[PDB]
Amino acid sequence: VNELERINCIPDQPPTKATCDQRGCCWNPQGAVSVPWCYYSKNHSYHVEGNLVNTNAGFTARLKNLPSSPVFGSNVDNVLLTAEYQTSNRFHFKLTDQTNNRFEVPHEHVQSFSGNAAASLTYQVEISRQPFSIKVTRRSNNRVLFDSSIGPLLFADQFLQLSTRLPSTNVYGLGEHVHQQYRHDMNWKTWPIFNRDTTPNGNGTNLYGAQTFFLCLEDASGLSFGVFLMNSNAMEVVLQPAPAITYRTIGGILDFYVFLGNTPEQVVQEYLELIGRPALPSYWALGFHLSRYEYGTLDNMREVVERNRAAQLPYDVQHADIDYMDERRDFTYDSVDFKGFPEFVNELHNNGQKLVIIVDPAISNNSSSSKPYGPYDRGSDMKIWVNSSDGVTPLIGEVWPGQTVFPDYTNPNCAVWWTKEFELFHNQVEFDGIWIDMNEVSNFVDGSVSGCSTNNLNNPPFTPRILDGYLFCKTLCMDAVQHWGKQYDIHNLYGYSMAVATAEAAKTVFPNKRSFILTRSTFAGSGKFAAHWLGDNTATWDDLRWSIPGVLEFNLFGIPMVGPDICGFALDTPEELCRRWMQLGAFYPFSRNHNGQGYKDQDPASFGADSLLLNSSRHYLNIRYTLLPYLYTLFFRAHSRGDTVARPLLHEFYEDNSTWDVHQQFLWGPGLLITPVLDEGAEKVMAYVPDAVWYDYETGSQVRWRKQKVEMELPGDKIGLHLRGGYIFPTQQPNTTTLASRKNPLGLIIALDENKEAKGELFWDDGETKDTVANKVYLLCEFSVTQNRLEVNISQSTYKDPNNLAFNEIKILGTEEPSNVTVKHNGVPSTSPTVTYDSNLKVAIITDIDLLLGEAYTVEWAH
Ligand SMILES: *[C@@H]1O[C@H](CO)[C@@H](O[C@@H]2O[C@H](CO)[C@@H](O)[C@H](O)[C@H]2NC(C)=O)[C@H](O)[C@H]1NC(C)=O
Ligand SMILES: *[C@@H]1O[C@H](CO)[C@@H](O[C@@H]2O[C@H](CO)[C@@H](O)[C@H](O)[C@H]2NC(C)=O)[C@H](O)[C@H]1NC(C)=O
Ligand SMILES: *[C@@H]1O[C@H](CO)[C@@H](O)[C@H](O)[C@H]1NC(C)=O
Ligand SMILES: *[C@@H]1O[C@H](CO)[C@@H](O)[C@H](O)[C@H]1NC(C)=O
Ligand SMILES: OCCN1C[C@H](O)[C@@H](O)[C@H](O)[C@H]1CO
């Protein structure tokens, strides 16, 4: 046996022969570090009984267990395999108990499959019977993608395991963790998944959300595939250098989806087609967000707001953390320390800004006739709390306000209760969006105020290697009861159900609007309802570096609006770290500076009205705002098609194996390469320049570099930003709010490829109405240059912006001098525009031009 293919048979304790012999496994302690001493024997597990049965969707098989004896509880001796050829590029199979129904994730988006197996499959499926294995191979080249034969199927009531071989070590995904790198190098590694309030640090623990999806790039041709496990029980994913991946969960069923694509982007698209594509954000939520834990008082918050406005910082959103509340209680504000809160929200709104308020799931149970607490009284009347195991007494835990009950957002009535709470509170404070925190769900006591009973749910046969080693640690009892089921099965779905309910509440509080929801805890599909932030990081250079894989991974997961706390939540931030972080932060899809309680100010203007940090921050935030039309269009593509927004180099440059492990750089979509300085003291970064034409964003000049590692010179006020030849970038002259910026003239940056061609697009709608896409109320146009001609072509034209918008500048990069430029509108000339040419940089700027948005034009020149 090859040692890299040994599947660990003692995942639960240090390995010993006595245990090994007792489990019927193989013993060989001679291997290298982490190679399993005790591993499963070749014939251990299930076999197919009888024949496979063709069905309309695919096939079923009956699986039978070769009689072993209990290790992690009751074995399931008769297992049903059901396989559905759902689409040409999506395969679904589940392993269930033949004789008993079991817990299955009640996903809000994924539906059951009905009717017939798809035509023109890109994959073929093979079943072996003695012993059972399942294999999925790519038809075009016979590449084995999924292959469970490396290990057994284990299917006990509270221990389910399946492994698959992998065709490469280019493996990306799984969460929520701090992986540190982007590519899983497949050395021996276990990643637990169980939603938990814990620090995203170098310890590799389970964090706030649960994401089983991974993507595998098979080879340099781009051919890629994805695997998703639809399971919400505590689990761990085990990676080894075979290469192989094992899923090990403590409940539910093994419900697997396999996705094939021609490129990594197609895998992501196929995955999001199944679980749900991300919500199109409000355009304002694409601006800069400022926040902190404990301004303490409204005067303090107002002071920070005011110094940043005085600095002319682009700055759309102010968040209000739990300090705004009356003693940290939802749906109240502090009438002393936040006296005049409603007038402040008026001032924000008058200045074109928005207010997002934090809300916690926990509701104080402290209500008397003397002092009534409305949210608690109303929720108690509606009977919408999580109950203890008796099924009828609301479970009591403890969070910020003291003893608390927790809403059962899996109950449709709880969304009606929650909605009414927000409508009532909105009458007092006119917030614009909602930040849902602590929704793992996070509890200051273990399980409940009376702890947790000793039983198979709170104290299961096997516990994955989760932080602290017990399931109910800093959360609800596992035998707590909700409408969807027991906490043991649905713990990982709490924040997901909270996002669903909060979206539902927004249909009433902000009629017809997207608003903005930011969530901490997620499950697969949470991006349909919410943005995400990476949690309570620290102001260290390690945290800055670790943020890039975190953002990339959440883009795989369909949560493209994701970012960390810029400058670092915990700790006072050093000026140099915060300056570098603000430079990079300008380019996170979610861009928020947030700071923990008690630490020194880290809002940009706190560093000084004429500090290098403030000047640089404003500079790069203005570039971010200039490029918002391009970013917004990327979000349109994420929402409508399922493309990523922050994109790894490898998704565009997979033919080049030097991109496969790049994680210190990333792209906005296909065209914009972002290269931060990420090292303390550094004024350079070692960077990779992919195989394309690149132009410096600011000067427009073509770099000499191509398909090579470079030492990019980046002084204290610089981040690397390059535009890819072949792409046209729509821009809008910036201002300090998107309310104002959206009224400004537009521009095009044409970055020419080797053949002097480029293409691009622009999506434009009202920026706020929900379902402008489903209802087809938008503008979509396409730009294409070849090679003495720009064509502006209109493809969807059901929104005309009443602000009279037009392109009034075209920048062309990598071009010989354009002469005698003409503008035709629907073939009719024409107005003669101004052209400025830099012969040294090879940049032309066309100005004194007025291409109305939503109209077709041709712009021609000669050389
Ligand atoms: C938690 O316990 C409460 C009672 O404290 C249950 O409330 C029931 O609510 C339904 C639906 O509104 C009513 O028709 C019942 O009459 C209520 N029962 C009682 C005994 O008051 C609630 O169902 C429980 N929730 C869960 C998840 O089990
Ligand atoms: C940026 O937006 C501001 C609004 O905050 C504008 O400052 C306003 O616009 C017009 C000038 O055309 C004035 O009548 C307003 O009084 C201006 N200021 C204020 C304080 O309201 C500004 O024009 C915008 N500028 C850009 C670059 O688009
Ligand atoms: C792991 O956690 C401990 C606290 O449990 C902390 O002190 C330590 O710094 C963490 N390690 C890393 C590598 O971040
Ligand atoms: C409940 O709130 C009241 C009103 O402020 C307070 O006096 C009392 O101590 C609280 N009870 C608990 C259980 O802390
Ligand atoms: O347990 C503390 C609760 N919250 C944790 C969040 O992750 C953080 O962003 C927020 O500032 C803080 C106060 O609301």
Coordinates of C-alpha atoms and ligand atoms in Angstrom, one line a residue, residues 329 365-368 371 401 403, ligand 4:
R329 CA -30.7 45.5 24.1
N365 CA -36.1 38.0 29.1
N366 CA -36.2 40.8 31.6
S367 CA -39.7 42.3 31.3
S368 CA -41.9 43.5 34.1
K371 CA -40.4 48.1 33.0
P401 CA -28.1 42.1 28.0
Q403 CA -30.3 36.2 30.5
Ligands
LIG4 C1 -34.1 43.0 35.4 O1 -34.1 44.4 35.1 C2 -34.4 45.2 36.2 C3 -34.7 46.7 35.8 O2 -33.6 47.4 35.6 C4 -33.2 45.1 37.2 O3 -33.4 45.8 38.4 C5 -33.0 43.6 37.6 O4 -31.9 43.5 38.4 C6 -32.9 42.7 36.3 N1 -33.0 41.3 36.7 C7 -32.0 40.5 36.5 C8 -32.4 39.0 36.5 O5 -30.8 40.8 36.3

